[PDB]
Amino acid sequence: SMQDPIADMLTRIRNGQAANKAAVTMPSSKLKVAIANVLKEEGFIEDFKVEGDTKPELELTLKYFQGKAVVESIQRVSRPGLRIYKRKDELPKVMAGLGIAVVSTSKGVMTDRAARQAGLGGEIICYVA
Amino acid sequence: IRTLQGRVVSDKMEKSIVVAIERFVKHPIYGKFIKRTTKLHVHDENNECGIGDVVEIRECRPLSKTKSWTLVRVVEKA
Amino acid sequence: AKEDNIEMQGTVLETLPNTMFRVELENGHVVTAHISGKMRKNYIRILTGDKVTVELTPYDLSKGRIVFRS
Amino acid sequence: ARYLGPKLKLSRREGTDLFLKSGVRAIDTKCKIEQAPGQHGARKPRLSDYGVQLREKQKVRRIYGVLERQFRNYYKEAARLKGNTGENLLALLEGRLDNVVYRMGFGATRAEARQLVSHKAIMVNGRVVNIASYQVSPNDVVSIREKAKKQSRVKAALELAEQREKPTWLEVDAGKMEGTFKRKPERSDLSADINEHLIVELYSK
Amino acid sequence: ATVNQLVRKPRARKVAKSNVPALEACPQKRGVCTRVYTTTPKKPNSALRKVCRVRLTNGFEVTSYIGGEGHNLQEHSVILIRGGRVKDLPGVRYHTVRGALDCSGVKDRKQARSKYGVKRP
Amino acid sequence: LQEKLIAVNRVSKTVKGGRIFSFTALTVVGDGNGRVGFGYGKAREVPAAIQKAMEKARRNMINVALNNGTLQHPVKGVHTGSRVFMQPASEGTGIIAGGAMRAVLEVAGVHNVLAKAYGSTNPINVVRATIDGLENMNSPEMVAAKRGKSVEEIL
RNA sequence: GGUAUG
RNA sequence: ACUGACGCUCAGGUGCGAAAGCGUGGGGAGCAAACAGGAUUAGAUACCCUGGUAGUCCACGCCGUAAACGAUGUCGACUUGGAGGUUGUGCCGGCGUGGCUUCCGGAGCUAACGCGUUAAGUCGACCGCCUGGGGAGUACGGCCGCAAGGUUAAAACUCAA
RNA sequence: CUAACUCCGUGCCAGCAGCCGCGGUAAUACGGAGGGUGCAAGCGUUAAUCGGAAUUACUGGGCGUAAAGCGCACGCAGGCGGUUUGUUAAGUCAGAUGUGAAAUCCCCGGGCUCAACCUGGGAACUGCAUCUGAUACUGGCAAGCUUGAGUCUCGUAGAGG
Ligand SMILES: C[C@H]1O[C@H](O[C@H]2[C@H](O)[C@@H](O)[C@@H](O)[C@H](O)[C@@H]2O)[C@@H](N)C[C@@H]1NC(=N)C(=O)O
Ligand SMILES: [K+]
Numbered sequence A: 001s002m003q004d005p006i007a008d009m010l011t012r013i014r015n016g017q018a019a020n021k022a023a024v025t026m027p028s029s030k031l032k033v034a035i036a037n038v039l040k041e042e043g044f045i046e047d048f049k050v051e052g053d054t055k056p057e058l059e060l061t062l063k064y065f066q067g068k069a070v071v072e073s074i075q076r077v078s079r080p081g082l083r084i085y086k087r088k089d090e091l092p093k094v095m096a097g098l099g100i101a102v103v104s105t106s107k108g109v110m111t112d113r114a115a116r117q118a119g120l121g122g123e124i125i126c127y128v129a
Numbered sequence B: 001i002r003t004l005q006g007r008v009v010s011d012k013m014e015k016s017i018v019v020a021i022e023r024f025v026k027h028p029i030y031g032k033f034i035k036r037t038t039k040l041h042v043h044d045e046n047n048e049c050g051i052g053d054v055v056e057i058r059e060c061r062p063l064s065k066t067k068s069w070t071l072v073r074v075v076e077k078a
Numbered sequence C: 001a002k003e004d005n006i007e008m009q010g011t012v013l014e015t016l017p018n019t020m021f022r023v024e025l026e027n028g029h030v031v032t033a034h035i036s037g038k039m040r041k042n043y044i045r046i047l048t049g050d051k052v053t054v055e056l057t058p059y060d061l062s063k064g065r066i067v068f069r070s
Numbered sequence D: 001a002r003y004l005g006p007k008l009k010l011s012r013r014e015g016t017d018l019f020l021k022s023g024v025r026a027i028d029t030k031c032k033i034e035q036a037p038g039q040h041g042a043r044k045p046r047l048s049d050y051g052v053q054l055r056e057k058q059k060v061r062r063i064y065g066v067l068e069r070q071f072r073n074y075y076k077e078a079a080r081l082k083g084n085t086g087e088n089l090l091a092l093l094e095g096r097l098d099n100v101v102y103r104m105g106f107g108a109t110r111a112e113a114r115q116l117v118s119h120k121a122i123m124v125n126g127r128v129v130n131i132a133s134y135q136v137s138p139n140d141v142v143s144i145r146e147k148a149k150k151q152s153r154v155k156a157a158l159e160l161a162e163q164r165e166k167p168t169w170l171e172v173d174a175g176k177m178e179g180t181f182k183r184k185p186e187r188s189d190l191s192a193d194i195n196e197h198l199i200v201e202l203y204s205k
Numbered sequence E: 001a002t003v004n005q006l007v008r009k010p011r012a013r014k015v016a017k018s019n020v021p022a023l024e025a026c027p028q029k030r031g032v033c034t035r036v037y038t039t040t041p042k043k044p045n046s047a048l049r050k051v052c053r054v055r056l057t058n059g060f061e062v063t064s065y066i067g068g069e070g071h072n073l074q075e076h077s078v079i080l081i082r083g084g085r086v087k088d089l090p091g092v093r094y095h096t097v098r099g100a101l102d103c104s105g106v107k108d109r110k111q112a113r114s115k116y117g118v119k120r121p
Numbered sequence F: 001l002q003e004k005l006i007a008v009n010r011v012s013k014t015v016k017g018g019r020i021f022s023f024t025a026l027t028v029v030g031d032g033n034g035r036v037g038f039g040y041g042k043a044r045e046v047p048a049a050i051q052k053a054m055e056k057a058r059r060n061m062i063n064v065a066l067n068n069g070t071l072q073h074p075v076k077g078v079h080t081g082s083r084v085f086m087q088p089a090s091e092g093t094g095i096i097a098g099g100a101m102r103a104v105l106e107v108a109g110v111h112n113v114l115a116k117a118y119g120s121t122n123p124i125n126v127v128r129a130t131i132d133g134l135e136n137m138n139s140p141e142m143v144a145a146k147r148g149k150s151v152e153e154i155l
Numbered sequence G: 001g002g003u004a005u006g
Numbered sequence H: 001a002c003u004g005a006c007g008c009u010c011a012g013g014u015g016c017g018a019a020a021g022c023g024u025g026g027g028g029a030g031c032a033a034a035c036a037g038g039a040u041u042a043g044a045u046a047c048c049c050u051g052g053u054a055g056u057c058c059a060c061g062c063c064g065u066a067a068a069c070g071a072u073g074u075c076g077a078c079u080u081g082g083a084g085g086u087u088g089u090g091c092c093g094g095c096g097u098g099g100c101u102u103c104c105g106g107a108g109c110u111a112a113c114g115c116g117u118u119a120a121g122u123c124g125a126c127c128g129c130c131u132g133g134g135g136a137g138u139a140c141g142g143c144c145g146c147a148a149g150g151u152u153a154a155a156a157c158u159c160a161a
Numbered sequence I: 001c002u003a004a005c006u007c008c009g010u011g012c013c014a015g016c017a018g019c020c021g022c023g024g025u026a027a028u029a030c031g032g033a034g035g036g037u038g039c040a041a042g043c044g045u046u047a048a049u050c051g052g053a054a055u056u057a058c059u060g061g062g063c064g065u066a067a068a069g070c071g072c073a074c075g076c077a078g079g080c081g082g083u084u085u086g087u088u089a090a091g092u093c094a095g096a097u098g099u100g101a102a103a104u105c106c107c108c109g110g111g112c113u114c115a116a117c118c119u120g121g122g123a124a125c126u127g128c129a130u131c132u133g134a135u136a137c138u139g140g141c142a143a144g145c146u147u148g149a150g151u152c153u154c155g156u157a158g159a160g161g
């Protein structure tokens, strides 16, 4: 059964990019939307929208640059089978700073850079080189 | 002040209950968070608890071979 | 610089696996002998019954190298 | 504990003057510097990458007259010190009293220097120091002792140093027969023929 | 292996056997020669290699190679054995130490003397 | 261009007669400033094999976006059964690498790098893994460009 | 119809 | 239309499980281990021929194994196509839309062969299993079995594959 | 491999050997010699541990054919769990306090002529406990929701038993 919706979201992005799809779409959730925002604001996706009310659908718009896909890598880190939390001082650097770790802190989901500046640890959702 | 909360798993002793405390701890090697359980023999003066209740307990002087904890309060009933 | 070998004459009694032979010497001791390298490479076949020269060692008088077949 | 063998063999093996003779006479006039020592010297074989690393290491050792255990410790120190391991290594070797006494021109060869130091003819900041390995620090004053200023070999050695390029990081009064280790040398101040990265690679294997 | 499986059953080390069990983690052992013979090697090689069967102080009984040209060992000689297989002799895991106890040094040897128990000329 | 011979191997086909031996040469060439190519040449004799490899290497050179004689970030390369890991190092580290990786990194002009080859260490595959890894290495500039950011916002 | 072995 | 996360996986457990085989009792055309004879051959404990018993069939009970194979664990999601088959269904022979299934092939994956929306691709959950060859699926012990045996399962040693 | 080659003796013998291998007449591989390489008051050998070994793979591996998917199912414990709101604050995160002996390691110094050694101060001791906060995520509790999973209605095909 479906036991990791975030991993599903990341896989839709990874797979959508490899298929050169313009948009991908999925069942929405607060957290998926939270992650989409971080992706948008770091410029790994162009845009996103939640349409619908009873069964909301998240729709990410994917970015390409000189034909190639902008999201080179996107791996789930913390997962249901094995959760990963890091303190402020031991937050991961993805691609020596050139990528993001998306972190869930007590002040909401943000990049590892943002969590370092706030002085917050939290759950490592994913890497996005 | 220093208390543990946990769940009664036996009441078949006079004035005594077994209480299972549940801890969630990161595995030293593999990093997975594992549920682990401590079972304490507890002192229950008035036999007020029964199996399934959630109880607050505090450490105290020895009271028997196996009891060094005493019931503070019953938090939830079965 | 090597120590000297006793060359003794003898008769092959049985052929054993992998060019090993029982050989009764003149003195009457039955050594387990093996074919020389030179003979192996030059395809000199040894048989039951054959007359053979056996190089021996003082270190072990149960063993020898067949060096010549008559 | 020291190499007491023929000096020019070492040069001939490395294929370079390691400055193991005074320099009163050119090295080609004393030995076939092109040709490696021994009966099979003439046939120049291709070295492996290990061989290249090795002969680099051995060049530096033989220059400075340091055996392998002491040399390896220099490497370990140079690696511990902050900055560039290879650079540090050459700085340490340059620090050695025997080297300094040579680079000041009190000894003809680094071995003569070593004998001066060993025989209690050298003072650092007024005190006698008979240890070739002694690390001279910035602003130290290396000097000949009163007793050994009347040694003909010291006079001769100073003449020979004038012929060589004078080190900048040292400053010698030839008349007083004393000198000042002003600073540690920079990599640039030492000879560029030494490829210290090979040595660091060698010790990382 | 999933995490959960490793939590339940952790990764196990390969339990590494010694190649020299008779030594019982000693650098050498003393023994008495019960037999001193020769043996032919495995396929490609050809020789009569000098060996001895030796009973050690710890009761183990082993075969030990006798290296060098020529030896003085008999039955009942007291020798020191050390580790070291001989590739072409099945079941020979030990070498005899030349120039220790009853085993003599090799005569007239001038190179690798220390390996064959021979004093400097 | 620097030029390095990594490996020479004698191969053979069988024929009615007996065996026809021939030679293979694996080489890398690079400018010492983040251009590097490899070539693999075959011939009946080694020098011709090497020459063919050098010719092929010269025409098949990639660009690698270096950063002051080291890598931009950690990289993983894979080819066939050869997995290679390379990370940036400090000045004076040197090339800490094994063999086929070293050649590629030398001639590309990587002065300081830590590297490790896992899996198969067949030179022909390790070289491909290494160069693969280098060719997919992102600089700060091209990351900023793809993400629609400036280099300062990235860094 | 079994093509034992140069 | 209804319930409202009631789900997925599953050590141990429980059951089902080709054929041969075993027990008791039926049945017995054809076929056929064993066996008898006839040949073939250097021999021919075979292949070939003539026969032929157990067995093959039934009932009940046991056994629990097979190249029990897709040599591919179960569940869920995602990711270009082409040609078929089969079974529903909607709409006007055509145009859709579901289920199962055969073949080819793209990206990708793979040591390669190949796999390729029924993945061996991209991911997530849980379980089972591997760690050089031989020794050995053997020994010992336990459990199961009327037995045949099955299951769990080593080591010494030897080889440099 | 691995820095360093010749002659003579021997002739798959004697012997070498960590592995690959060498030795059967012109052996850079055995023994001696000359020459050379490496170490040096040591040098070799053996033993033993970690490394290289991503060869037990948490970091960091595999299972179609290389070793590896239970013959197949159901299913208890266990592991994992769609979506919204509230609440809780167990996990998690933050700050602080206590503690984490000294020695050792590391850093910056100081002393023995130097070094080893000795030594001042620091850092570290990745931990544990407590208190005070944060509340995104996970867990708990409460209430929901319908997209997972089911039930009902009508019908269809099928060597399912
Ligand atoms: C016909 C024979 O075929 C097979 O033996 C063959 C032998 O007869 C020769 O032709 C060669 O050695 C082949 O290489 C062998 O395979 C072997 N199966 C035995 C057979 N012979 C008989 N069964 C018989 O002669 O009778
Ligand atoms: K350093």
Ligand SMILES: [K+]
Pocket: E044, E045, E046, I012
């Ligand atoms: K041989």
Ligand SMILES: [K+]
Pocket: H010, I076
């Ligand atoms: K269960």
Ligand SMILES: [K+]
Pocket: H053
């Ligand atoms: K019958």
Ligand SMILES: [K+]
Pocket: none
């Ligand atoms: K191919």
Ligand SMILES: [K+]
Pocket: none
């Ligand atoms: K084995």
Ligand SMILES: [K+]
Pocket: none
């Ligand atoms: K048994």
Ligand SMILES: [K+]
Pocket: I057, I060
């Ligand atoms: K793993």
Ligand SMILES: [K+]
Pocket: none
């Ligand atoms: K919560």
Ligand SMILES: [Mg+2]
Pocket: B062, B064, B065, B066
């Ligand atoms: Mg008590």
Ligand SMILES: [Mg+2]
Pocket: none
């Ligand atoms: Mg010393």
Ligand SMILES: [Mg+2]
Pocket: none
């Ligand atoms: Mg049957």
Ligand SMILES: [Mg+2]
Pocket: none
């Ligand atoms: Mg029956």
Ligand SMILES: [Mg+2]
Pocket: none
């Ligand atoms: Mg019949």
Ligand SMILES: [Mg+2]
Pocket: none
């Ligand atoms: Mg018949």
Ligand SMILES: [Mg+2]
Pocket: none
């Ligand atoms: Mg089976």
Ligand SMILES: [Mg+2]
Pocket: H069
């Ligand atoms: Mg089938």
